[model samples]
Every structure is written in structure tokens, then in C-alpha cells.
Target: GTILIDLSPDDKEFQSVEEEMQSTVREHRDGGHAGGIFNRYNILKIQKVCNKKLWERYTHRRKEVSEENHNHANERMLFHGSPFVNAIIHKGFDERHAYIGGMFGAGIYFAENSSKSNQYVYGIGGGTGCPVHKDRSCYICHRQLLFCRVTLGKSFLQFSAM
Candidate 1:
């Protein structure tokens, strides 16, 4: 159903992906926030997610909608940052944890901007026993940001109230 294919650090694709992520973070740093430019974390590894079942479901839904509108599926790739990275990778997006008082109602929230999406990331580790230490026995610390493919099929555009 779901598979994570880890790319070696030396792989060109892995380097490219890391660069993209770094650039996004750099963009955020240069955006003139309260504190001018700070911590630039390095991405250790990149994994290619192969969620066959989810892809099949998405394609089916897209096809069903496209049939009704002559090739308009309204598909968009968005970013989603959260602490429940493992849970999401295993079970897909669960609306049960969505914020009820969200700006646009309780749904699986996705963001167009990586900087905005980065705001929700909550990672652990990097403490006393964290990896990248003198001893190589510690665990590697990481934060996950999901890049999701979604369809906004006839989605509502709310201005003020939800």
C-alpha cells in the first residue's frame, strides 16, 4: 500500500530534492520576518513515497470528475507540515485531527507556500543523545514536511466566515 524508497545522500535526485527544500527555507528566512534569518537545517535523506492504493483512489476520483467536465480534474500539489508524519504515511490524511476552528473549516489543511507549511512542523530529537554526535550510536533527528497531491474539485473559496 505505502512504500518509502530511501535515496542515498550521494544520489543526484536526493541532492536536488534537498536543495529545493533548502531554497524554500532560505526563501522564508529572506522574507523579512521579525527576527532576520536564523537556523538553516540540513535535510539528511529523501524518501520516495509509493502509495499505490492511495494513488489508485486518487486517479479513480480524478477520472470520475474529469468525465463530468471534459478533462478538468482540478489537481494541485500542496505542502502539509505536521508532527504526525509517521501516522499520516501509514494511514493517509485523517480529518479526525483537523483543527475545528481552522480558517476554512475542519479539513486536511494544505498550503501553497512551503514557508507557511513549515510553520506546523513539530520534530523531536537533537537532544543530548541525538545523532550527529561524536559517537555514532545515537538516533538521527528529523522533521517531516509532506508534499501532497490533491484535487480541489469544485472547492469553495471562502473570504471571511466558514
Candidate 2:
């Protein structure tokens, strides 16, 4: 038998799909996380509603990991504040060239942030304007002489030191 279908309508094909996420409810949602870069803490249950628009001039990257990984976990990995990495490298805040003097991804060690949150301001920003990546790329939020370190196998969390 042959069947005809018409989906030329607003939210038509999707409304008839599963309704909530527009997909059929599967019994094993956990199976979907295999090799997946993101985890459950990444979701926004309304209470999990996060922020954006940190800076007007700031933009995003190709991959969302460099964009927005496991929230604060991936946030520290890619980007950070200026003096944060600079001080460790023994460079001054204004010395941008010194940081990228001679390295494959010299920009990786140092980066920035404009917003402040225990949560992620979002992006690759570790501390300064140039963010590194786990895969190695962009960064997001934080400000006012902020700095960070991203360690661990899969997560990029930080520690405030002297």
C-alpha cells in the first residue's frame, strides 16, 4: 500500500512526534551517553537555567565543547583570566606576545571572562581573552583579575590559590 503525507505546517511533524523533546520516549536514555561529550548536569530544568551575553563583542567557537562543555567542568579547561596563567608563566598582564612567544597553541595556557558565577559564564575562557581547549579552542565568563586551572581526565574544574 502507498501512503501520502503532508508536513507543511507549523510544529506539525514534531507535535505528532513525542511532544516533550519531539522524540519517542525510550526506556534507556542512559545508553545514549556512550562516548557522548556531555553529561546530565548540563541540562536546564528551569532551575538549571543558565546565563549568556557575557560581553557584547565576544563570540563563540566551532565545537560546543570549546563552546560549552560540561558547564563549569569544561569551562576551566579551555579558558581563564589574565594574571591567572600569566603570573604562573611569569609574564605581565599586558604582555600578550610573551605568552604566545613559541608554542604550538601558545594561546591555550591563558584566556578571559566578563561575567561572574560559581556556575559557568560559558565558553573556552580559562582566564584571559584567549581560551584553550580540552580538544583545544575557545572560553567564556568571569572578570576582575580572575584566573583558573583545568585539570582531571574529563572535567575542567578550578582552584583559587595564592
Candidate 3:
């Protein structure tokens, strides 16, 4: 399990281009002569062009990663409900790519603010501990171990070699 931060959407260069395009649209909209025309067609055209350019840049970056690093440490892995995974999928990641469980599992417990404090614990584990069948996949077990490490915030919570 790993974290891949794709900065395409947050890229400064792309953001500048987007800002410039937005300013241009604002200007066209404010100008009375071609306001209606710009609002309808020009805005769409600008959006399409910007989207195409951004996608091209993102694809190039992804290709660079693929070429330079194809090992386990750098391989693309999919985790459920991860923003990074969603971004990769949105950018057209192949389904054949490696898939791994998430390193950190998240959960929240909610109760009435009044009365008494409530505590809850949730764990992501395989077999009886998790809803998914153990034979179905080992991702849950891996995720559970990873989560334990993170939640415990220690290098060696328990010593075991298996």
C-alpha cells in the first residue's frame, strides 16, 4: 500500500492557464458586442481546448512514470474510495494495473453531543472480521495489517515473523 499524489489538477502551470481562460471568458461576457455569442459558443470552445491540453499534460506525466518506474514501489495500485485512485481512473488508468489495499483505514463514530462520550472502533480485516470472504482476496488482510501499523503509530507493535 502506498500513496501517489498526482499534482496535475493542482499544477501551477495548468492553474495559470485556467485562470487566463476564465479571465478571457469574463471579459467576453462583460463586453456587450459579442456577449451572447461568447456565452454560448466561445465558452464551450475554450473549455474543450483547456480540457484537451490539461489531459495531454496529465497523460504525458503518467507515461513518464510508467516508463521510468515499473516496479512494485512505483507501480499503480488501486484502493477503494481513494482520491488518488479516482484521479488515476479518471485519467484512464488501465484496469490490468496492480491493485492493492489502502495503507490507512478511516472510520468515524458519531453520538449525541449532550449526555455521555461515545467511543467506537472499526477495523478492516479479512475472514470473520470483515464482510468479504477470506478466499476472495488477500487485500483485506494486507489492509488490516497496514492499518494496525498506522493506528498504533509504532514500528513494532508486536514482533512476529511469518
Candidate 4:
């Protein structure tokens, strides 16, 4: 029997996004095991793969940097930051493409967790549709997956979303 490994969680830029999400979760009162599990099982691997690919691509384009004198740096940063454009630019991805990659990766990871078998995933807030305010805005949008775990015989449900 083949041991199937889901490597979709490993991507560098996605890792950055995941980091941002984890930070958000830490700030909230209800944040708990769901955030912890997702970070431990999913985000780290995606980060490693993304870093390796970034380094490899940078190496191949080493000459371009010298020839263009850092022109690509700004564009690379923009591509890394932009959800709309990064997928097309960063093709041949080891993980899924950038936009929804982290969330998809987390979903796969959570699906494998036994404790979370009773959990239901939901989206609470934040996305491209919800833009940050123009003034006094620190714009960082994270695509997060929420898991609401309902106890066996209890009326209450423990909710955690990231």
C-alpha cells in the first residue's frame, strides 16, 4: 500500500500568509487548538517548500538581477504580495497556487486530525471583498478556515477559526 502524503501545505509565500493568520488568531480570545493544530501540521511544511522554490528561482535568475540592477526585486515583491497576479507568475508550483493555497492546505491537514473529526469548517470574516479602510489602515487580509467542534452530548460548541 502506498502512503499518500498531501504536500499542498508547503509553499513559502503561503507560509507568510499563514503566519499572518496565526498572529491574528493569537490576538483573539477564542483562539485555541484549531490554530495550534493547523500551524503545526500544515503551515510549516508549506513554508519550507516555498522557501526552496524561491531560492531556486532566485538562483536561476541570478544573472537577471545583475543585468537589471534590482528591477526584478520590486516586481518580485509585488508578485509575492499580490493575490490577483502571483498565481500566474509563480507557476510550476510545488503546492497549490498562492491565493487559496494556505486555506486548502489547512483543510487537508484538519481532515486528517482525529480530534477534529467532529468539527465543521466555516468562514467567519475577511477577504478581497472586505478591503481595508483607506485611512489609518493596516491592510492584511488572511484567508482563514474555521472549525467548530461540537461536544458529544453538550449544547455548547467550541469554535476556532483561522
Best-performing candidate as measured by TM-score = 1
Which candidate number would show the highest lDDT if scored against the true structure? 1
User: Candidate 4: worst 10 consecutive residues by lDDT?
Assistant: 146-155
The ten-residue window of minimal lDDT in model 1 covers 122-131
RMSD of candidate 1 to the truth, in angstroms, is: 6.5
Better of 2 and 4 by TM-score: 4
Clashes of each: 0, 29, 0, 6
TM-score of 2: 0.18
Question: In model 2, how large is the Cα lDDT of residue 39?
Answer: 21
Model 2 per-residue lDDT tens digits across residues 31-114: 322111222122111111112332211223213334354532343422323334324323322336435532334443433311
Judged by lDDT against the true structure, how good is candidate 4?
Answer: 0.31
Q: Of the candidates numbered 1 and 3, which has the greater lDDT value?
A: 1
C-alpha TM-scores of all predictions = 0.68, 0.18, 0.17, 0.22
**Predictions ranked by lDDT, top down?**
1, 4, 2, 3
Q: On TM-score, who's better, 1 or 3?
A: 1
lDDT of 1 at 82: 62
lDDT measured at residue 33 in model 1 versus the true structure, 0 to 100: 37
User: Each candidate: what lDDT?
Assistant: 0.63, 0.28, 0.27, 0.31
